[PDB]
Subunit: 381 residues, 4 copies
């Protein structure tokens, strides 16, 4: 009766990534956060064992991992270092427009490099004046001969400056129909006229660089185009249906690492002659954490399986899984800090970082408010 | 990729029970509640299509439906009439101690009658002074020759007076070790010295009779014994691991029928020139309802599959699924009443009954407080 | 230091109404609910001790109680019978348009009768197609000589059929400016062409009659007019600024009676060898109930004092106090049912009625959704 | 009708502290947090206008401000800089054992210095192995001639290293009765054998130093004793009844500054052609923030007035106000971050610091869990 559980191969993949995460990634998490620096140790351990971008097809030298497997990887990394979890998460986000809409030549040019881990990918959608409202973006791409000239800026780009390649969405016709006048392009770190802004000072995922892309007449070849002229936003949003699920998986992981730490702590700590775990009010809190986490985890796995089959209701299930899991992670991390008392408020324990990191999950890949707008559209048609 | 969904056979069973529920059961739900009377129409339609006790093995003339199938049946009935959903739910609860612990002869005597629907089952555990604290029960069974003599009372028995057979737990040794001095017996409606109390006046599931069993020197044969002397509480609690999941499935159904009604209503109703559904604050409420329901539904299906395999962690997952789904159903029904305004507060719409019925799901088969005690034990060992 | 408490005279008024409520009103509450019948015993005890309409000015034979005193009365009644609390609450709601906008002659005609308790008042604003959207009402009043002719219907009128007088809002010019084409009139129970609909079957406040007013060419004298032609909605909404606070006071009372009962119960009931109150998870629940109730109570008193002074920010504080206190009452009553276990789900204990009654407080005098619309307008200008 | 509001003198004090806070304190808040350094600018502006310790009696050169006035000061500072708010809050916490239990000579020695602002006070209760469980503390004070010798350690001391004087609680008889074998002493920064630990690295209130006190045979005169031998814990806990209210006032302030910023932001920011404030889902969020804040604020003022009169139920009201206001501040700050989107997650806006600072309010002066233990004791006796 193999209903409603991961396969044996998924559970073996879980032990393998857990093992890389606990030995190679976890030891460096406090320092990655404290110095706001890229988790280089984690990148190298993920690259050595093929967990840095597992979703890439075997045809390109990839692992060809399914959508649920990929979620388990991101979850198990996020359990110990949220910044590190963004290596596979943003590698998927940036590459997915190619995998969904790109020509065989574009795929063949870029995906092998991701597969071997010589290159990381970023995704450039958001701007200063168009975050949630992606259709109002102002970055322009103009034909010049067979070339494209890009002008404008993207905001908030994860792994910017480290990533070699940048999937960038830009207006290809300012008079074309709203939502359908935008195209996707691969931009290289060394393209002319392309700079980065100063790194953001953030609440959490501090080791993940977050920076503006600035495009000053960036000339790029015509073969940088991903899919069809004007179909770029369509591709960028179809991407978010799949990747929202991985941010759900991240939130679950962050929540799980916080619960693991709090549980271990309250079994050991004694006040009034008893373990903190022996107080029923604490038991009730722990039960609530565990029950909500498990509900979020299963809902993520249901959405991941939907992502793998491309089920017609993926839009609702990806928004619900991401929203739910991020809300739950926010509550659980806040409670994990609480359960350690004074100690939980200090950087000597990891729970305060986990609380800081959880808060991003409610904002990126579409604010939980936008998630609710998307869920309501699906219920009402 | 058949991960994290019901089988095609489960979806065909869903359309069949939905069809019986909408045509034969739903039309009578308001009257079942209003007159506090047994849903006889529903019993007859469930019996005619083999949904009154689907879990019984084919060996006994049953459907031999798996634990998830059984949950979908209870869910789809509970969508339209919570009182009716208790026909399969309490049939399982009452029969499960036989299925788990009874001899071939006991099973062969009672299960065929349930399978054909000539008999309903009830379960007698709780007492006046021992609800949550089952191990402190005072109903006694004393050997007399080969017979047993039962003395005491059970409280709160669902389908009492309608059920022909009663799985009753009683102390078989007042000096034996706590938790392990209790046995299970099948009691017939016509056994000597056995009466019922006056029906409870309840908030909801009003058509489901709820009554005390009174045992005044009830003489019954030695072959009424279910499993082993002293192992009765062990069996009764193992039962609740499986059946807690069906109360989760019930809560989901109640919540789903309330959301279906509220959605339909807010698309039609206009204030300030627009459909109520067009107000973003209402959209956010509806999204929250739908997202929480879906998280509860999936968590129930994960627990049901665990019930079918008898996974070692069933105890945690059944308590979490039941607790979560009942909490969520309470919130959603309260919000469904709200979304209809004045109309939602009247018995002309079904949402107020659905709110009243949802509240029981937080109390029976173990209060949500006891669910949290059980979940905390499992996390801490 | 007389800051942030009621006066000694308010505390003496509290003991007097508590005393009338516990002896004369409470004994009949279960029967008032069970038979859906008017609380006649309560009306007579409130009339005998001047608590049926205490807000009326001494100039009219009234008690001239301030807005906070009036809230304490409604609170202390609502502690034992929510239906009874609506005698002073709807007496205020119906009379307030006269007190605020009526001529000396209108006041002199109607308020003395309320003061002595020969007459109850109702308020007719809502319609079938205009609840929340009051400005879209369709009840019309047309001049004919010096008379007015009323045509249409009002929905959901509390104490209808018992009340002698009806403050009714109607369109006095279908071409006039939206919001400012409506007038208020006093309608007598015996006016020609005036009938009532069949009583609503409700979830709670079942002893309070709730019925449609039907106006079939109701001819009434020109001196029935309350304030100025077209200024009627302005008066009706100014009323709701004051009266929303009394529904806050009601919710507090309902919540307080539920907490009183649950506390008393969990001190007495024993499971597992201890009082239910000795379990820390229950302690935490009780603390949460008590803390939220007290926050709602104080916020109501702050709004009541604002109502008495007519502070400029009353609109925000009345909506916030009503919304908060009703949300809190809904949660507390739901938890009070839970704390009694099985017993809490039966009509032999009063907590289930208190839960049913609490739910109305989230809907009338402006849905909590409308309360949030009003609060957001005030924050944003 | 002067019910349920601050006096005119309280509102004039509010404008004066608001004015000092916005001009002299607010400009430095981001840098105080970013460099984890003491808010020296704020100390000097508070000292110049007599807001650094306003509660001290005029008899000692103080302002003699009442308990509500003192709460408004802490609230208005906390609106712009939570670290700065702890100057008056910890000055009160440290001095209160003297004000409540100290001799005229002890008061005359220490309070004038606080009043003029030449000295700050700290309070040393908590230890490594006794936080919540204060009665189990192990710091010892032993008589030697007329002197006392202190040995042990205190944990988590706010303003340690800056404060000149330290009210320290220590065991004065290890064989005496639990709870009643402890005394309070004033310790000077230059007493022999007294050192500080390395400053804690914290989530928030980073400019407030938090450090261990280490006592290595600290010899101090007999006249350092505050009140009576063995009555020290009694005094320390009576203190917390008053000071818990100021942490409520702090939380309110933090919440208010976060709401002020979010409101201002959502009126200006446009997506999809409209101000973010024009989206009803955002309106509902803002209403909820404002309504909960106001309920917390009033409940704090009610508790402050109780603190000023020393009402018999202060214990319940101080725990409820502190718990409620800190829970509400945690939710509101989390929502304020959310309402700014990406910007809210960066240190260029103050909302993320406000979220980090709010979390401490749930932990110090007694964890919200301990607050619930205290509230349940008061309800149940
Ligand atoms: C750490 C970090 C990393 C990021 N990485 C990337 C990346 O790699 N690639 C990329 O393209 N982007 C990235 N982003 C951008 C991120 O997804 C955007 O911030 C997000 O889409 C919100 O946009 P915004 O900040 O402009 O907020 P806005 O759109 O200005 O929204 C502000 C507030 O308004 C609310 N709101 C907006 N519209 C509505 C509506 N219609 N109804 C109700 N409420 C509404 C929002 O929920 C929010 O609370 C990143 C952001 C962060 C913080
Ligand atoms: C409609 C209905 C149908 C029922 N049908 C059946 C049936 O068919 N068969 C059957 O055997 N029983 C049946 N019951 C009984 C039901 O399961 C019991 O009410 C339930 O086990 C709770 O028992 P109680 O009412 O005695 O509450 P108590 O055990 O008295 O509990 C009272 C309160 O204390 C709390 N509490 C108790 N122990 C703890 C603890 N250790 N820690 C924290 N909080 C605690 C509970 O959660 C509850 O809130 C039914 C009940 C109802 C209402
Ligand atoms: C027991 C009872 C007694 C009553 N007594 C009286 C009385 O004495 N006098 C009287 O005049 N009326 C009375 N009423 C009417 C009551 O105040 C109305 O039901 C209320 O104003 C809501 O109107 P409605 O039922 O038409 O709901 P609708 O206005 O149809 O609202 C339906 C749903 O839409 C939501 N909604 C509506 N507008 C918005 C919006 N703009 N933004 C977001 N959500 C929105 C509402 O909150 C609600 O959830 C009574 C009602 C009841 C149930
Ligand atoms: C920034 C900061 C500043 C501080 N400043 C001062 C200061 O100036 N002076 C001072 O004396 N102290 C100070 N403290 C100490 C602070 O008040 C303590 O941390 C607090 O009393 C909790 O103690 P703890 O950390 O040892 O947690 P513990 O007591 O170990 O508690 C751990 C967890 O167990 C829970 N818990 C404990 N007992 C129970 C129970 N009986 N029932 C249920 N749950 C329980 C707690 O709520 C918490 O969630 C400060 C702390 C911080 C973080
Ligand atoms: C991970 C980060 O940090 S980066 C990404 C962060 N940003 C986001 O997640 C953006 C959040 N916003 C969005 O998802 C969208 O802008 C929304 C949901 C707000 C909708 O905005 P709208 O202006 O209403 O867009 P609309 O729904 O018209 O979509 C525009 C076009 O894309 C298409 N589209 C939208 N969603 C999808 C989808 N899931 N799959 C395929 N196409 C889609 C539309 O159908 C439309 O094309 P069409 O006109 O030919 O049908
Ligand atoms: C559906 C209704 O309306 S009817 C049922 C309603 N009532 C309930 O759900 C009862 C709620 N209460 C319970 O579940 C239990 O009484 C609990 C969880 C509170 C535990 O009570 P305790 O006194 O702590 O019982 P304890 O855990 O010692 O269990 C007693 C015995 O049953 C066994 N047992 C308990 N749970 C299980 C289980 N899930 N599977 C098998 N055996 C079990 C124990 O191991 C023990 O036997 P042992 O001593 O040989 O190990
Ligand atoms: C107790 C029950 O069961 S009965 C009452 C139940 N019904 C309600 O509570 C109704 C709920 N709805 C309302 O409060 C209103 O209809 C609202 C808040 C939704 C606003 O509706 P809108 O169409 O937006 O009305 P608007 O705000 O323009 O008000 C109409 C007029 O009344 C005035 N008005 C509104 N509120 C007030 C007030 N508090 N005081 C004085 N005048 C007011 C307006 O200023 C306007 O007159 P103007 O154009 O001369 O300024
Ligand atoms: C601000 C910070 O960061 S510093 C302060 C941080 N720490 C705290 O707030 C500590 C939290 N803990 C406490 O409040 C207490 O230790 C509690 C509530 C957990 C109670 O602990 P217990 O061991 O149960 O203490 P108990 O209630 O017996 O109190 C000990 C003694 O103090 C007395 N006492 C307790 N509360 C008070 C009070 N509010 N007023 C006066 N005396 C009091 C008791 O009556 C008792 O003396 P007694 O035996 O003569 O009656």
């Amino acid at each position: 009766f193999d209903l409603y559980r991961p396969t044996e191969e998924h559970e073996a993949l879980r032990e393998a990534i857990r093992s890389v995460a606990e030995d190679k990634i976890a030891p460096h998490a406090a320092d990655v956060d404290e110095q706001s620096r890229f988790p280089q140790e984690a990148y190298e351990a993920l690259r050595a064992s093929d967990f840095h971008a597992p979703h890439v097809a075997e045809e390109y030298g990839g692992v060809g991992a399914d959508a649920l497997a990929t979620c388990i990887v991101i979850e198990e990394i996020a359990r110990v270092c949220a910044s590190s979890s963004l290596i596979p998460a943003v590698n998927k986000l940036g590459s997915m427009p190619l995998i969904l809409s790109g020509s065989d030549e574009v795929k063949q040019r870029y995906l092998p490099e991701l597969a071997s881990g010589e290159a990381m990918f970023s995704y450039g959608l958001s701007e200063r004046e168009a975050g949630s409202d992606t259709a109002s973006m102002r970055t322009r791409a103009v034909r010049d001969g067979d070339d494209w000239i890009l002008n404008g800026q993207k905001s908030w780009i994860t792994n910017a400056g480290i990533s070699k390649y940048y999937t960038v969405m830009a207006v290809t016709d300012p008079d074309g129909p709203r939502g359908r006048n935008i195209s996707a392009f691969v931009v290289h770190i060394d393209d002319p006229g392309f700079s980065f802004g100063e790194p953001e000072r953030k609440l959490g995922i501090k080791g993940s660089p977050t920076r503006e892309l600035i495009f000053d007449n960036v000339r790029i070849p015509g073969d940088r185009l991903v899919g069809k002229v004007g179909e770029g936003l369509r591709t960028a949003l179809r991407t978010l249906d799949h990747t929202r699920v991985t941010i759900g998986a991240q939130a679950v992981g962050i929540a799980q690492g916080a619960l693991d730490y709090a549980l271990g702590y309250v079994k050991e700590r004694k006040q009034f002659g008893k373990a903190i775990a022996d107080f029923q009010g604490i038991q009730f809190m722990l039960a609530d954490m565990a029950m909500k986490l498990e509900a979020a985890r299963q809902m993520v796995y249901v959405a991941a399986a939907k992502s793998e089959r491309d089920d017609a209701d993926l839009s609702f299930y990806g928004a619900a899984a991401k929203c739910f899991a991020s809300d739950v992670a926010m509550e659980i991390t806040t409670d994990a800090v609480q359960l350690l008392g004074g100690y939980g408020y200090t950087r000597d324990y990891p729970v305060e970082r986990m609380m800081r990191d959880a808060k991003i999950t409610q904002i990126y890949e579409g604010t939980n408010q936008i998630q609710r707008v998307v869920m309501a559209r699906q219920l009402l048609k």
